[PDB]
Amino acid sequence: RILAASFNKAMTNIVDAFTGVNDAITQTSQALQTVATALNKIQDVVNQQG
């Protein structure tokens, strides 16, 4: 019950971080730091290719 609950709560913080509606609270964990790192890396790929 706790393993599932912590997993479900983690996904919500991931989806909301991709959209950016939780951008002011993205430093609450270094797990959310990886979301910022991934978005930083993706945007370079989307821009530098052209």
Partner 1 sequence: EYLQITSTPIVVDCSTYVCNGNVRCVELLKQYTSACKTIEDALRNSAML
Ligand X SMILES: *[C@@H]1O[C@H](CO)[C@@H](O[C@@H]2O[C@H](CO)[C@@H](O[C@@H]3O[C@H](CO)[C@@H](O)[C@H](O)[C@@H]3O)[C@H](O)[C@H]2NC(C)=O)[C@H](O)[C@H]1NC(C)=O
Structural contact between residues 17 and 23, judged by C-beta atoms closer than 8 angstroms: yes
Report residue 49: phi and psi, to 5°.
-70, -30
Kindly tell me which residue out of 6, 8, 19, 30 binds ligand X, with binding defined by CB under 6 A. Answer: 30
Kindly tell me which residue out of 27, 29, 37, 43 binds ligand X, with binding defined by CB under 6 A. Answer: 29
Contact region with ligand X (CB under 6 A), list: 4-12, 16-24, 25-33, 39-47: 25-33
Q: How many CB atoms lie within 10 A of CB 32?
A: 18
Q: How many residues bind partner 1 (CB under 8 A)?
A: 4
Regarding 31 and contact with ligand X (CB under 6 A), the answer is: yes
